Design a binder for this molecule. Structure first.
Ligand code: NI
Length: 341
């Protein structure tokens, strides 16, 4: 049944709760972003109101065929009224169109649901600075101190320099980047930009990117693989077998592949720096795993919470085991005692 951490008390609202059938007493279903574990269950047959960002609404209409009359897009950074309750959508610094949601309950309680987010100091100057938040429904994906990772800027710098150097040394090398969802577009777009190429991809993925309101996107992507030297493939295909195969398909236009797999975290982060990453190589194929995260590190998450000083925290990730839940609750108590709220 719908878990309690997907329900907003004092309202008939749910968040990211589309796979439970009809949730008894739900008058409005919010969707934070277009990732499959969150939208799971939506289709052209859904007939309740869905509240979301403009970008998420484009994706619901064009990729899932949800009917327009049930899509309610809201602008960001704007006080809006939904079924008599004041709400605001904030940028979550996750994937395109991802939001956090502030609910102002009739009784005076203020609730923030982060959806999926990568905490950033910029959030400390949004409409969040303007009032107190009593309850926080928190993306705890990486809530343990082993999870450190570099800035997104540092990671894109590494990828751009690596690709530029490789292709300048060998003009017959192909760059391949893996994907399985929206998010992390900067990786492939930054590389294509430094190389003066467009990124080539399947028709389904091209359609997905045309939903995202990215400025000048017609200048950066294409469905013509042959005119492109940065290809996007399914993440499943980013291995030596899948890449040797793909190389055959280009008909000797290329003799070398350099591939990037933008992972979340991998345990080489506990030891190694970004400057010291190395690929796995077989023959003329090299695969780089790069730690490009669209979720908070442990320290980024801790700073956000110690800034916000909520009265109660409700985790939304890693809630399935007692040992995970207990460990997270220990970190929350440390944070509160260190900061004095
Ligand atoms: Ni997500």
């Amino acid at each position: 049944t719908c878990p309690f951490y997907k329900k907003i008390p004092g309202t008939g609202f749910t968040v990211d709760a589309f796979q439970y059938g009809v949730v008894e007493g739900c008058t409005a279903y919010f969707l934070t972003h277009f990732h499959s574990d969150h939208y799971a269950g939506l289709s052209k047959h859904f007939t309740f109101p869905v509240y979301c960002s403009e970008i998420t609404g484009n994706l619901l209409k064009n990729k899932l065929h949800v009917q327009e009359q049930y899509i309610h897009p809201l602008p960001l950074d704007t006080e809006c009224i939904v079924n008599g309750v004041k709400v605001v959508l904030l940028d979550a610094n996750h994937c395109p169109g991802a939001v956090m949601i502030l609910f102002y309950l009739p009784n005076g309680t203020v609730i923030l649901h982060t959806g999926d987010f990568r905490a950033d100091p910029s959030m400390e100057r949004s409409l969040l600075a303007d009032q107190k938040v009593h309850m926080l429904y928190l993306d705890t994906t990486y809530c343990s101190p082993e999870y450190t990772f570099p800035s997104q800027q540092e990671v894109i710098r590494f990828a751009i320099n690596t690709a530029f150097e490789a292709v300048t040394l060998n003009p017959h090398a192909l760059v391949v980047c893996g994907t399985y969802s929206i998010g992390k577009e900067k990786v492939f777009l930054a590389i294509a930009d430094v190389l003066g190429s467009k990124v080539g991809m399947s028709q389904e993925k091209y359609k997905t990117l045309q939903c995202l309101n990215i400025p000048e996107i017609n200048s950066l992507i294409t469905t013509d693989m042959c005119s492109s030297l940065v290809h996007l493939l399914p993440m499943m295909q980013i291995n030596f077998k899948g890449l040797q195969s793909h190389l055959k398909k280009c008909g000797g236009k290329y003799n070398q592949i350099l591939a990037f797999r933008p992972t979340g975290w991998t345990h080489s982060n506990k030891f190694t720096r970004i400057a010291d990453v190395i690929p796995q190589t077989k023959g003329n194929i090299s695969i780089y795993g790069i730690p490009y995260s669209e979720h908070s590190s442990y320290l980024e998450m801790k700073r956000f919470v110690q800034w916000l000083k909520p009265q109660k925290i409700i985790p939304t990730v890693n809630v399935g085991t007692w040992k995970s839940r207990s460990t997270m609750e220990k970190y929350f108590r440390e944070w509160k005692l260190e900061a004095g709220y």
